[PDB]
Amino acid sequence: MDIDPYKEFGATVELLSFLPSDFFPSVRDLLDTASALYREALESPEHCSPHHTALRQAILCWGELMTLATWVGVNLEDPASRDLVVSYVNTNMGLKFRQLLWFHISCLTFGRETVIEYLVSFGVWIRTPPAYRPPNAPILSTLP
Amino acid sequence: MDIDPYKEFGATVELLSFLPSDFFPSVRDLLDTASALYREALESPEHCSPHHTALRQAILCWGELMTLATWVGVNLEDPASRDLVVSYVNTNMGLKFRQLLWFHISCLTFGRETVIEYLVSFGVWIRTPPAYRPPNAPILSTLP
Amino acid sequence: MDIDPYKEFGATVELLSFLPSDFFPSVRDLLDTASALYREALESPEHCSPHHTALRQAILCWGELMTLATWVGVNLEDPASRDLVVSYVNTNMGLKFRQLLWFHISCLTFGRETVIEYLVSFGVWIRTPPAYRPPNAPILS
Amino acid sequence: MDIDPYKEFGATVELLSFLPSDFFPSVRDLLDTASALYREALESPEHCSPHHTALRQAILCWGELMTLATWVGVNLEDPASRDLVVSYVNTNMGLKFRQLLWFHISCLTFGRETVIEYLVSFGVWIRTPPAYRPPNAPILS
Amino acid sequence: MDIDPYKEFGATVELLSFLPSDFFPSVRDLLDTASALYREALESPEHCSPHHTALRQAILCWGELMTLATWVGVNLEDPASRDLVVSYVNTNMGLKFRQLLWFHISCLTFGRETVIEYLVSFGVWIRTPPAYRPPNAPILSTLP
Amino acid sequence: MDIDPYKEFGATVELLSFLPSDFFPSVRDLLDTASALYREALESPEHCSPHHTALRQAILCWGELMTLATWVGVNLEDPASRDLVVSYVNTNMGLKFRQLLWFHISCLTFGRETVIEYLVSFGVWIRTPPAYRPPNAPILSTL
Amino acid sequence: MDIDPYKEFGATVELLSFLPSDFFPSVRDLLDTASALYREALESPEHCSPHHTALRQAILCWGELMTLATWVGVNLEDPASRDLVVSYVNTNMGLKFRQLLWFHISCLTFGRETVIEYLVSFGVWIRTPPAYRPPNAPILSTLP
Amino acid sequence: MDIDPYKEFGATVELLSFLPSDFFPSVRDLLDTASALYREALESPEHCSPHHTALRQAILCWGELMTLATWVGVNLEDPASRDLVVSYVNTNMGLKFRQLLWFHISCLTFGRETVIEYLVSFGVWIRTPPAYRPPNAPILSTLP
Amino acid sequence: MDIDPYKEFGATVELLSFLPSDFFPSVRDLLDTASALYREALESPEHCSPHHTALRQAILCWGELMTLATWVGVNLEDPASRDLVVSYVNTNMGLKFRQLLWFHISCLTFGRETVIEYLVSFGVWIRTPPAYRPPNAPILST
Amino acid sequence: MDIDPYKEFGATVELLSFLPSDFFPSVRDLLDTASALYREALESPEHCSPHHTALRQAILCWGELMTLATWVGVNLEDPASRDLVVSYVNTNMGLKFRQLLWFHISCLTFGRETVIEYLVSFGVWIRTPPAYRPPNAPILSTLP
Amino acid sequence: MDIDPYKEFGATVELLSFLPSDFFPSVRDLLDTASALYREALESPEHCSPHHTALRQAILCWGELMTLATWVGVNLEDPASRDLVVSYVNTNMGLKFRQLLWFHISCLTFGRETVIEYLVSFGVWIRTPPAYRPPNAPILSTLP
Amino acid sequence: MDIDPYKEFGATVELLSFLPSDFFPSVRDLLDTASALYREALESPEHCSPHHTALRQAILCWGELMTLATWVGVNLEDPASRDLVVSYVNTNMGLKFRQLLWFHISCLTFGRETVIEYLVSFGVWIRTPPAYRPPNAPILSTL
C-alpha cells in the first residue's frame, strides 16, 4: 500500500536514511529513555500527540515481536532455525524499530523541526569527506 | 509498560475480546477495504486523525510481519519449523491485528461512539439466549 | 511497594541509569562537598528542602553502612569473607549512594530543573555511539 | 556532620532513647502497615510531606540492606561468616530502621505533636518504679 | 561561447575551484540528498527557483551521461577502451558535476550568500597555516 | 528521479514528441542561431529567464560532451571503439540536445504559448494522412 | 576557647580545608605579595578593614614564630631537637598560617564574596572527575 | 615590614612600654578574664570591634603555641631541649601575648581612651622617684 | 631612499618583523586567495584602494620575478648555480613577497585597523617567552 | 590573472609600447630625479597619490632586486652564471622597471593626462616615416 | 636618594618583582617594538606623557651604555676584562632596562591600570603551585 | 632612534654644548643640591613635573653607573683596564650627566625660560672679547 511511517510528521525514509544504520541507539536504551521520560503520557487515555500515538503503536508491536521471539525460543525444536529466527527479528526489524523509536522520542524531547534540521545537518556532516569533517558531529541537546 | 492500544480511542482489550474471536473479518479483507476506502487519506502527508495514525502504523507493522513470514519460509531449512512459525504468526498475531484493523477501519467509516456502542450491543446480543433476543445479529451499516 | 527515590523529585532510576559509573565522584568526595557546602543547613532543626531531607537520610544511612564495614573488619575471622563483604559494601552500595548523593547535592547546587535537563542531554550524548558523539561530554556548571 | 534523623521533625535521638529497644515492632510489621496505609502516597510524584520523603528513603535503604543480606547468604562461602552477617544485619542495623520506620509511620498516622507527647509520656511511664507503674503502658491509639 | 555556469548565480568557476577537488561529496551522495530534500520541488510543473532549474538540468544530463557510460560498457568490445572511457567520465566530468550539484543543493538548503561566504571562509581557512587557524574546518549546518 | 526537462516550461517529452525525429535542426545550426541571437544575454550575469538558464546549462554541457568526444578521439587506440563512441555521442545525445536547443531558442524567439500552439498544430498536420495533408506544413514566424 | 578565625569573615576552618593542602602558595610568597600590595595600608595608623587587622596580627605572630625558629636554631644544642622543632614550625603551623595569609590577602585584592565563591568552586572542581569538568583549574585574577 | 600591633588602636610599643614588664597579669588570668567577660562576643560571627578581632587572633595563635609546647614535651626525647623550648616560649612570648591580651581586654572594659590616659599616668607615676611618689599607683576601675 | 612599504598604510617593517616566517601562507596560496577574492577589483580600471594598488604592483613584481626564475632555470649551464639562484629567489626574496601579499590581503579582508591591532597583540604574544606564553597564538579572523 | 600595471592610470601596456624600449632613461637617472623631486612625499606616511604608492612599491622592489644581483655576484661561484644573471637583471628585468619609473615620475611631474597625450603624440612621431619625421622628438615640458 | 623608578607611575620595584627575571623580552625586541609603535612620539618636542619622558631617558641611557660596551671592546686591549665588562653590562643593566622598557611600552600600549592589574594577576598565577596552575598564563592583548 | 634629551624641554645638545664643558658643577655637587632641595619632591608618589621625571631617571641611571664602576673595580682583576673603565665612566659619561643634572636642577629652581635665556647669555658673554663685555660672568640667583 506504500505507507510512509514519517510522511505525516514531515520526514521520509530517505531523510531518516541520512543517518547511518549504526548511528541509532539500541532498542533497550530507546525503550528505557521512552519509559523514563514519558511513561505517564504513554499510559494515559488521551491523545497527547501523534508522536505519542505512534510510540504506543510501536511499543506494542515491539512487545508483539519479543513475545514471538520468546515463544519460538521456548517452543521451536530446531536450534539453528531458532537462532536464525531470533537473530533476524532482533536485527532486521530491530533497526526498523530503532529508527521509529529514536525519531519519535527525539521529536517529543526537542521539537519536530529541530529533529528535521538536525537530520539535514547530520546528512551534511556525514557527507563531508573525513579529511575535512570536523570532529564535532552535530548532536541534539539543550545546553551550550 | 502496560500500554493499551485502545485506551486513547475509548476502548480496551476486554471490550474487543467481548466480541467472539471469529467475528472479525480476515486480515486480507480488512486490508482490501482499508485500501479501497482510505488509500489517499492514509498516504497523505498530514495528520488526518488518530485513527489514521494508528491505521498507518498497523499496516506498516503487518507488512513487516509478512516480510518476516516470507523470510522465514525462504530461509528456514525445515518445513516443520517453517509451518509452525507461519501458523503462529497468522493465527496469534493475526487475531489481534485484525481486531485493531477492524476497530480503526470501522471507526473511520462510522463514528467512534457508533463502533463502541456496537461492540456493547453485539456482546450483549451474543450473550443473550436465542429465544429472548432479536433473530438477526446486529450489523453496523451506512444505510445503503 | 515500588518506591522510586527520584520520582518524587521528577527523575527516575532509568533516567539516572545512563550516567556511567566513573561519572560520579567518590563517596568521600561527595560527603566532603555536602559538608563544606551545606553543613549549616543539614544540621539545622527545620526542613530546608526535600533535597535537604533526603540528603540527611542518605548521609545517616551511609554512616550506618560504614559502621557496618568497620564491624565486619573487626569481628569476622576469615579474611576471604571479610574482604568480600567490605568490597561489596564499598562498591555495589557505593555506586548507589554516590548516585543518590550526587543527585541531591547537584540539585541543591544548580537547580532541580537544570539538573534534570542536563541529565536528559547527557543521556542523549551517552546513547550516541562514539563514532558520532562529540569527544567532550556535557558539563553541568 | 552530626546529623540528627529527628531534629527536623522536633524529636531527638535522646527523646527516642526513652523508648526501650525491644518496644519497637518488627521491621516486617512496620513495612506491612506502611504499605497498607500509605502505598498510594509513597508511590506518588509529590512531596506529600518530609515524613513521606524520609519514609521513602528508609524503605529503599532497607531494601538495599536486604539485598546485601541475600547477596551474603548466596555468594559468601563461609557458613559461620554468612550466619553471623545475616544474624547481625537483622539485629543491630534492624534496630535503627525499626526506630525510624516507627517514628515516621506513627507521625503520619497520628500527628507529630501526638508522637512527641507520646514519647514524653512513655518516658514517664518507664521511669515510674514497678510498684507504682500502671499495667497499661501508654499507647498512641 | 564563453558561458560560466555560476556568473548568473553570483559565483565563478575559479571560486568553485578555490576549494580542494576532493572536498566535494560524491555524485551518488549528492543525488541522494537532492532527491530526499527536494524531489517534489524538482518534479513540480513550475519554476520554483533558478537553482531548481539548474539542478533539474544537472540531474537530467548526469542521467544522460550514466546512460552513455552503460551503453559504452555493454557495447564496446575493447575492455581497455571501456575502462578508459568510464574512468575519464567519472573522474573528469564527475568533479565538475559534483561541484555543480553541491553548489545548487547547498544554495537551496542554506542560502546563496551563505554558500558564497562559506566558499570564501573555507578557502581562506585551508590556505592558512594550521598553527594560526581554528582547529576545526568550517561546515554548513541548519541547526542553531 | 523522473524530472521532465519541459515540465516547468509547460511542455512534456511526449507533447514535444509530436515533432518527427528528423524535424529538428542540427546542433551546429542551433548553436549558431543561439549565439547570433542571444550571445549577450547568455553571457550576462543576470537571470534573464528560465529559458536562458536552461539554455546556458545545455550549451555548457554540450561543449563538455564535445570535449569528451575529442578526448576519446585523441586518446583511444581502438579505431572501432573510437568511431562507435563518437557516433553515439553525436547521434543519441545529439538528438535530445537538438530537441532542447530548438525548444529554448524557439521559445525565446517567439513565445512559450506560440511554441506550444505550434507543437499542437504540427502534431495535427503530421497526424493527417499524406493524401489530405496540405502542402504547407506549419511554421513559426513573424511574417 | 573554641574560636574560629573565619566566622566574622564568612568562612570556617572546613572551607579552607575543602581546598587541597598543596594549593596554598607559600608562607614566603604570601608575605612578599602582602608587602608589595599593602605595605602602606598595613603600616598605617588607621582601621582600614577587619582583613587589615587580621593580616597585621597574622604577620606579627608569624614574625614571632620565625623568632622562635631562630632562637631554637641558635641557642639549642641538640641537632635532632632543632631539626624537629623547625620542621614542625615550618609545616604544621606553616599550613595554618599559609591558609590564613592566603585568605586575607586574596580577600583584600578580590572581594570576600569572590574569595568564598572561589573556594566553593575550586573544591567542587577538584572533586569532580576530570572527564566531566572544564580542563583548566579555576583562577583568581583581576583582568577583564 | 615592621607593623606596630597597637598603632592601629592608638598606642605604640614605646607608649605601652611605660608599664613595667612584670606589671602585666598572668596569661591564665588574662584568658579567664577574656572568657568570663566576652565569650559570647568572641564567639559571634560579627566584627564586634577591632579589639574583638585582635583578641580572636591572639587567643587562637596562643592556643597554637600551647599545642607547640605540648608537642615538644611529648615528642622531644631530650629533657634539656624540651625544657629550654617550653621555658623560652612561656617566658619570651608570654610577655608579648600578656601585653596584647591586657591591652585589648582593658580597651573593651573601661574604654580605649581611658587605657591611653592610664598608660600616660602610670608612666608619670613610675618615672617619679620612689621617695616622692604616692603610695597608690594608678589603677583601672569604675568605682569611687 | 628610506621608503617603508607599510608606513603609508600605518605599519612598519619592524611591526611586521615579529611574525614568524612560517606564519605566512605559501606564495601560491596567497596569490590564489588574492585572485579568488578580488579578481574583479584587481583587474578593474579603477583606484579601488591603496591596498588594491599596492597589491597589483606586488602581484606583477612577483610574476616577473618568477619569469626571472624560469629564465635562470632554462638558460644556465651550471646546475649548482641554477639551484642556488632558484632557491634564493623562492625563499629569501619570496618571504618578503609573502609578507607583503599577506599584509595587503589581510587588510582588504579584515580592516586595516583590525589588522594592525592584531599585529600589535601578536607581537606581544610572540615576544612573551614560551614558559609564560599561552599555547594558542592569536588568530586574525575577527 | 592578467593585471595591467597602467590600466588604473588611464594608460595600457600597448599604449606605452608606442615608446621604443631605447627611449626610457637609465634606472639611475630615474631614481635620482624621483629622489630629488619627491623624497619628502615618498617618505611621508600618507597616501599622497596612487602614483606615490606605485612609486614606493617599484622602488622597494628594485632595491630588493639589486640585493638579489649583489647576492648573486657575491655568493655565486661560476663567472659565466654570475655574468648572465647580472646582465639579465640589469637589462631584461630593468627595462620594465625603467618603464614603470618613467611613467610614474612623469605623471607626478607633468600630469596623467599630459603623459597620455605625450604617449599618443610620440606614437604619431615614431610612426611618421623618416622623411617627414621632424628632428625634434616630442618632449614633456613645464614652461622652462 | 632612594628614588623608586615606578612609584611615580603607581607601581613599585617589588610589584614588578612578581614577574620572573626571564619573563621580560630581549632588549633588542623591546627597542624594536618601541621604535615601531612610537618613533613619531618619542622624537617630537612635546611632553606627550611621563611614559614618553621616561622612555626617552631610558633609550638614551641604553645608547650610552652600548657606546660604553663598544668603546671597552675596541680599546683596553684585554680580552678577559672586556668579556667580563660586556657580560656584566648585558646581564645586570640588561635586566634593569628590560624591566623599565617593558613597563613603559606596555603601559603606553594597553593602559597604566591594565598593566598595573596585569602585574597582580600574573603574580597570583605564578604564585600558584604548578599542579593547580592553569595552562593559560595571563597576557596583555586586545583580542578575544 | 635619534632622540634628544632636551627637545621636549626646549633645548638642544648643541645649546648645552654652547656652554664650556668645564662650567658645569661636579656630579657630586649636583646630586647634593638635588637632594637638599627636592628630596621630598623626587621621592613623592606622583608626577610633579617633566623635570622631576627626567631628574629621577637621571639619578637612577647615575646610581646604576656607579654600581657598574664599583663592580668593575671589585670583581675585575687589577690591570690598567679597571683604571681606564673608571676614568671613562667618570669623565665621558660624567660630562653629559653633569649637563643633564645641572639643566634639570637649575630649571626646577630659577625657571625654564630663565635657564634658556641664561644659556644664550652666558655663551655670548664668553665668546665676546673681554674688553667689550661686562667684567662679571652671568649667574643665576634666587636672591
Side-chain angles (χ1 to χ4, degrees), chain C residues 47-85:
Chain C
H47 315 103
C48 295
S49 193
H51 291 297
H52 276 107
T53 302
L55 212 47
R56 287 178 204 122
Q57 314 293 335
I59 292 158
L60 296 156
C61 291
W62 181 250
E64 294 294 328
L65 183 63
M66 286 306 128
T67 286
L68 183 63
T70 303
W71 183 87
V72 167
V74 173
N75 290 318
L76 292 177
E77 291 90 4
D78 63 317
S81 299
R82 195 201 312 277
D83 69 63
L84 294 174
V85 176

Side-chain angles (χ1 to χ4, degrees), chain A residues 1 8 43 47 56, chain B residues 2 8 43 56 96 112:
Chain A
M1 183 177 176
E8 65 183 1
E43 307 193 334
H47 316 285
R56 289 174 195 125
Chain B
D2 49 13
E8 64 178 274
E43 293 179 353
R56 287 175 191 124
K96 64 183 181 293
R112 183 203 281 169

Side-chain angles (χ1 to χ4, degrees), chain A residues 84, chain B residues 67-78 82 86:
Chain A
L84 282 71
Chain B
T67 303
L68 182 62
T70 290
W71 180 101
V72 299
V74 166
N75 286 22
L76 287 196
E77 52 264 6
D78 45 354
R82 291 163 63 185
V86 185

Side-chain angles (χ1 to χ4, degrees), chain C residues 20 22-23 29 33 35 39 139, chain G residues 14 18 120 127 129 132-134:
Chain C
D22 55 294
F23 181 89
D29 291 331
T33 302
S35 308
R39 191 197 282 271
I139 306 309
Chain G
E14 186 167 1
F18 197 41
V120 164
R127 266 138 191 99
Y132 312 92
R133 72 186 188 210

Side-chain angles (χ1 to χ4, degrees), chain C residues 20 22-26 28-33 35-37 39 109-110 118 122 125 137-141, chain G residues 7 10 12 14-19 116 119-121 123-135:
Chain C
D22 55 294
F23 181 89
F24 309 114
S26 314
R28 189 73 264 166
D29 291 331
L30 282 166
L31 288 173
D32 303 359
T33 302
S35 308
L37 296 195
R39 191 197 282 271
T109 308
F110 301 109
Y118 160 79
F122 190 84
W125 187 82
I139 306 309
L140 179 59
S141 296
Chain G
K7 298 293 183 182
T12 61
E14 186 167 1
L15 277 73
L16 282 83
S17 182
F18 197 41
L19 263 57
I116 285 170
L119 292 151
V120 164
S121 301
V124 181
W125 178 94
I126 197 165
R127 266 138 191 99
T128 289
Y132 312 92
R133 72 186 188 210

Side-chain angles (χ1 to χ4, degrees), chain C:
Chain C
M1 265 200 290
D2 169 68
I3 298 179
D4 202 15
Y6 321 96
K7 184 178 184 292
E8 176 189 350
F9 310 96
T12 67
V13 297
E14 313 297 317
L15 179 51
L16 282 75
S17 59
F18 294 111
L19 296 172
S21 281
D22 55 294
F23 181 89
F24 309 114
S26 314
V27 176
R28 189 73 264 166
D29 291 331
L30 282 166
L31 288 173
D32 303 359
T33 302
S35 308
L37 296 195
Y38 296 100
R39 191 197 282 271
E40 59 271 13
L42 295 172
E43 286 194 355
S44 67
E46 77 290 339
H47 315 103
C48 295
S49 193
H51 291 297
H52 276 107
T53 302
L55 212 47
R56 287 178 204 122
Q57 314 293 335
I59 292 158
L60 296 156
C61 291
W62 181 250
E64 294 294 328
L65 183 63
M66 286 306 128
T67 286
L68 183 63
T70 303
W71 183 87
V72 167
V74 173
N75 290 318
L76 292 177
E77 291 90 4
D78 63 317
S81 299
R82 195 201 312 277
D83 69 63
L84 294 174
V85 176
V86 192
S87 74
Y88 171 74
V89 163
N90 279 110
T91 309
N92 286 252
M93 292 180 183
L95 183 63
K96 313 201 42 164
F97 272 107
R98 275 155 70 192
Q99 178 180 131
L100 180 67
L101 290 164
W102 175 90
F103 177 72
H104 289 299
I105 290 172
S106 315
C107 284
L108 287 166
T109 308
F110 301 109
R112 197 186 37 81
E113 191 206 340
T114 300
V115 168
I116 63 188
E117 81 166 1
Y118 160 79
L119 183 63
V120 171
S121 296
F122 190 84
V124 174
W125 187 82
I126 298 297
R127 282 180 260 125
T128 286
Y132 312 94
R133 68 170 77 154
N136 274 349
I139 306 309
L140 179 59
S141 296

Side-chain angles (χ1 to χ4, degrees), chain I:
Chain I
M1 77 178 58
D2 201 334
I3 298 188
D4 209 329
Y6 319 102
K7 184 177 180 180
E8 159 191 28
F9 305 101
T12 61
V13 296
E14 299 98 17
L15 183 63
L16 275 296
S17 71
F18 285 119
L19 308 156
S21 74
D22 61 273
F23 177 84
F24 312 102
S26 177
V27 186
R28 209 146 61 238
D29 291 331
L30 282 164
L31 287 173
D32 291 331
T33 316
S35 305
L37 294 175
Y38 295 100
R39 186 180 295 275
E40 295 83 4
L42 295 169
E43 294 194 347
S44 88
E46 293 179 353
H47 301 110
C48 295
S49 179
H51 288 300
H52 273 113
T53 296
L55 195 59
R56 286 179 203 117
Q57 312 297 336
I59 290 158
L60 292 155
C61 292
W62 180 251
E64 284 184 320
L65 183 63
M66 289 291 119
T67 287
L68 187 153
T70 293
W71 183 85
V72 305
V74 159
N75 296 115
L76 269 192
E77 56 262 7
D78 189 19
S81 301
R82 178 198 268 103
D83 295 331
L84 294 174
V85 176
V86 176
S87 87
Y88 172 73
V89 170
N90 271 285
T91 306
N92 296 113
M93 184 177 177
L95 183 63
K96 291 175 71 175
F97 272 102
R98 289 171 65 194
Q99 187 183 105
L100 180 67
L101 291 165
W102 175 89
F103 174 72
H104 287 304
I105 292 166
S106 296
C107 283
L108 283 169
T109 314
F110 300 109
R112 169 198 295 182
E113 199 207 330
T114 300
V115 166
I116 58 179
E117 172 187 318
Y118 168 80
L119 270 175
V120 171
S121 301
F122 191 91
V124 181
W125 179 88
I126 193 66
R127 286 197 315 271
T128 300
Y132 323 103
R133 163 207 288 162
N136 276 0
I139 66 185
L140 177 61
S141 186
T142 69

